[PDB]
């Protein structure tokens, strides 16, 4: 019963200070009790929303980073009319490293709103896409299972993409939010947009994330927090922390 008065003080002050005015997201940052044993990879583990949405995929500048041959992915995605306008630019890794070096990378940080790689080239990417995006987790590159097709061991995996299924993944990755695991206790996850939807939308969105992170079931993506959450702290990218549920 402390949530809204904490959160009304956030939004009211978000209007007043002009330095605070520029930012447009709401994070919840959570100091769990014990140290989380998982070290920080940059594989963003997404959580599901049970009630609301965060973004339709037609609200975001969306970059897609695919494999090298890339003609099977360029032209299947464009023509099949579920994903014509869905991606802003379809780019290849070979055409990413070669094209955007140096100071063009800050523009591409600022140009696109959400970046998604093919899963099988997601790991090669922090050298290519650059060390700007790995400051925090705003433009952290998601991955999409391109194919709905498994790689069997000692077996040629065929190249094939079906734009119903990658549309289905972007709808499943833009409506809900995402955390990243840390070796320490403090971690963060975004909960809502500051003017898309107000406090009772965010307040339902709060209780899903602390529920998904706590369950022993749904374990490889939600079974992270062991023991009990000590506190949760509502604050933007720039504001100070506002306590809620101090025990």
């Amino acid at each position: 019963g402390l949530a809204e008065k904490a959160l009304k003080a956030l939004i009211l002050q978000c209007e007043e200070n002009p330095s605070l005015k520029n930012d447009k997201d709401i994070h919840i940052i959570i100091n769990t009790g014990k140290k989380m044993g998982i070290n920080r990879d940059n594989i963003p583990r997404i959580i599901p929303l049970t009630k609301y949405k965060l973004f339709k995929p037609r609200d975001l500048n969306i970059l897609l980073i695919t494999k090298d041959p890339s003609a099977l992915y360029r032209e299947t995605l464009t023509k099949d009319e579920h994903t014509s306008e869905l991606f802003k630019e379809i780019i290849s890794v070979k055409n990413l490293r070669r094209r955007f070096k140096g100071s063009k990378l800050t523009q591409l940080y600022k140009d696109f709103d959400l970046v998604v790689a093919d899963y099988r080239v997601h790991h090669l990417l922090p050298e290519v896409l650059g060390s700007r995006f790995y400051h925090g987790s705003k433009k952290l590159p998601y991955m999409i299972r391109m194919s709905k097709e498994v790689k069997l061991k000692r077996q040629q995996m065929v190249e094939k993409c079906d734009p119903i299924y990658v549309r289905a993944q972007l709808r499943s990755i833009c409506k809900n939010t995402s955390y990243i695991p840390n070796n320490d206790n403090c971690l963060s996850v975004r909960v809502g947009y500051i003017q898309k939807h107000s406090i009772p939308e965010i307040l339902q969105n709060i209780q899903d994330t602390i529920n998904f992170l706590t369950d022993k079931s749904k374990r490889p993506q939600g079974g992270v927090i062991k023991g009990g959450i000590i506190s949760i702290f509502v604050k933007t990218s720039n504001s100070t922390s506002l306590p809620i549920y101090q025990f």
Partner: peptide, 17 residues
Amino acid sequence: DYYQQVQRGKQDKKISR
């Protein structure tokens, strides 16, 4: 005036420390 009361709360906790 609740936000600054929290903002002075964390700030005064350091200077006590």
